[PDB]
Structure formats: structure tokens, C-alpha cells
């Protein structure tokens, strides 16, 4: 359930999207030069932020999320509380992180509004969801909703939570080519012993989805393991608890400053 290394291409595009993620807590700082920076996602009371963006080098829609930014984001951290994904009824008896949930619908049409709005001008473009972090569970059941609608749907996760219930890990799976790595749409990325992608407890009914992306320090394509299956291995299996450096710092880029 481990095969340690992946190509150097693949490498690039982790830290691309990582350096997007990151970027997402100050105001998408030194993003690649390729990509257009468009529509604002927002909703001041759940204080969700976000971005949709636009690269027609690579030809295709970005949508960002930022992750814990405030106080009131954290209020949505906290909140295990499992709830049913009635945003996507055919996830047969998917239920979510209740926090996540509430941003989620917090934004949901904004979010659907936009990204249609790229979209329809462009039916040709893929499109890539991405967070760190809150901002990756945000991404997580974004990326969910679009692909019961479009097709070519990506996902790109950082420190990403349990987001929600096994139903929804299989969902997610099959929705994405989770079965094998050669053909994911869903890359979980996760760092040294960070402590969120063991948040909340699988015993509480969390589970994951997608293929996971574990880098190990130092940071590099030769030091980043394949991990796949269900035994506990990787980064779930180094006891990494709550929010810690490795969390942070995804491929040497801390979510703060911007040294990129
Ligand atoms: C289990 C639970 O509390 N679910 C409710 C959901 O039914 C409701 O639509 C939403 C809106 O606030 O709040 C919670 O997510
Ligand atoms: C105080 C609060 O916001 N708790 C919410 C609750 O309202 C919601 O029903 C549940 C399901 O998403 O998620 C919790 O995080
Ligand atoms: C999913 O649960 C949590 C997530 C965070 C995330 C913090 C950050 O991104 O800075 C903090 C506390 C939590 O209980």
C-alpha cells in the first residue's frame, strides 16, 4: 500500500498546487505567471474565502480555497458533527464534516455560479479544485458537487482533513479513478507527521478518499510515497496530532509568508 517516489512531472504539479493553496492565505501571492486571477468566493459570516482563476497555458479553471484564515473559521475546524451531503443526494448516504458542511453551503451557489462562469466559456478546460487544509475539505466536497455536473474534474488536496464518511470516500473514489494511481483525479497530499489528515477520529466515522501523496522530509519527487489501500501507513501512521509544523509547510512553502 506504499511505493515510495513519483515522476518529476507529477512532483511539479503537487508544489504547483501547494504554492497555490499556500498562496490562498495572502491574497494569491507569487501564483505561477501562466494563470489569470479571477472571481472572488466569499461569505463574510462563514468567512469562507477563495478564487477562481484561469490558466490557458494549461488550459484550465482553477478554484482555490484558503484555508483556516480567522476565528470563525476555526468555529467550523472544531465541529465534527457528521451530516448528510444533501447538496449531492446521489452520494448515496454520504455524510460530511458538519463544519465543512456549513461552509460549504455557505458558498455552494457562489461557487457553482462562478465556476459555470469560466465554464461556459471555456467547456474545453479542466477543471481543478485545491486547498490546504479547511480550504482542502472545502475543495474536497467542491470537487464533488462538480463532478456529478462536468467531467473533467480534478482535486488536489494539502493537510486535508477526514472530510467525511466512508460512503463518501467511495463516492469520491469512483468519482475521481481512485482504483489506481496511474488514472487518480484525486491527489491527497500529505507532509511528515502533519496532524490534521488524522482529524477527525476514522472511529467517529471519518474515513478518506483519494490516492494519498505523503512527502517526507526532505521534501523532493524521490522522497514522496504512493499511499493505497486501507492500512494505517504514511503520514495517518506517524501519531502527527493537531495543527504542527509539518502541517504548515507543504513542499518547503509555509501557508503564512510567501517565500515562493
Ligand atoms: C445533522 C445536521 O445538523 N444537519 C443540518 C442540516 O440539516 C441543515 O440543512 C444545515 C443548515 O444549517 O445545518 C446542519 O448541517
Ligand atoms: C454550531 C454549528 O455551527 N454547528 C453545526 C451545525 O449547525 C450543523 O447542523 C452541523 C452539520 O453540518 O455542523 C455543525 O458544525
Ligand atoms: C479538521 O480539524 C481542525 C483543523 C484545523 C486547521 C488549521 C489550519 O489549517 O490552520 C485546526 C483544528 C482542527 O480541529
Known sequence: ?????????????????????????????????????????????????????????????????????????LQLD???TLTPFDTLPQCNDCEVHGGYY???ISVQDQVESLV??????????????????????MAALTAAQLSAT????????????????????????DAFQVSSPETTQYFRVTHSNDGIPNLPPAD?????????????????????????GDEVQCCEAQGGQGVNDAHTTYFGMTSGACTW
Open 1 to 73: 500500500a506504499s511505493t515510495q517516489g513519483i515522476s518529476e512531472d507529477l512532483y511539479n504539479r503537487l508544489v504547483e498546487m501547494a504554492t497555490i493553496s499556500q498562496a490562498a492565505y495572502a491574497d494569491l501571492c507569487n501564483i505561477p505567471s501562466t494563470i489569470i486571477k479571477g472571481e472572488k468566493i466569499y461569505n463574510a459570516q462563514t468567512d469562507i474565502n477563495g478564487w477562481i482563476l484561469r490558466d490557458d497555458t494549461s488550459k484550465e479553471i482553477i478554484t482555490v480555497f484558503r484555508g483556516t484564515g480567522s476565528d470563525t473559521n
Open 78 to 80: 472544531t465541529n465534527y
Open 102 to 104: 456549513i461552509g460549504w
Open 116 to 137: 459555470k462562469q469560466q465554464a461556459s466559456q471555456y467547456p474545453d478546460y479542466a477543471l481543478t479544485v485545491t486547498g490546504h487544509a479547511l480550504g482542502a475539505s
Open 150 to 173: 462536468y467531467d473533467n474534474v480534478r482535486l488536489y488536496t494539502f493537510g486535508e482533513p477526514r472530510s467525511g464518511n466512508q460512503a463518501f470516500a467511495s463516492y469520491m473514489n
Open 204 to 228: 467517529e466515522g471519518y474515513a478518506h478518499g483519494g490516492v494519498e501523496y505523503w512527502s517526507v522530509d526532505p521534501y523532493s519527487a524521490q522522497n514522496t510515497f504512493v499511499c493505497t
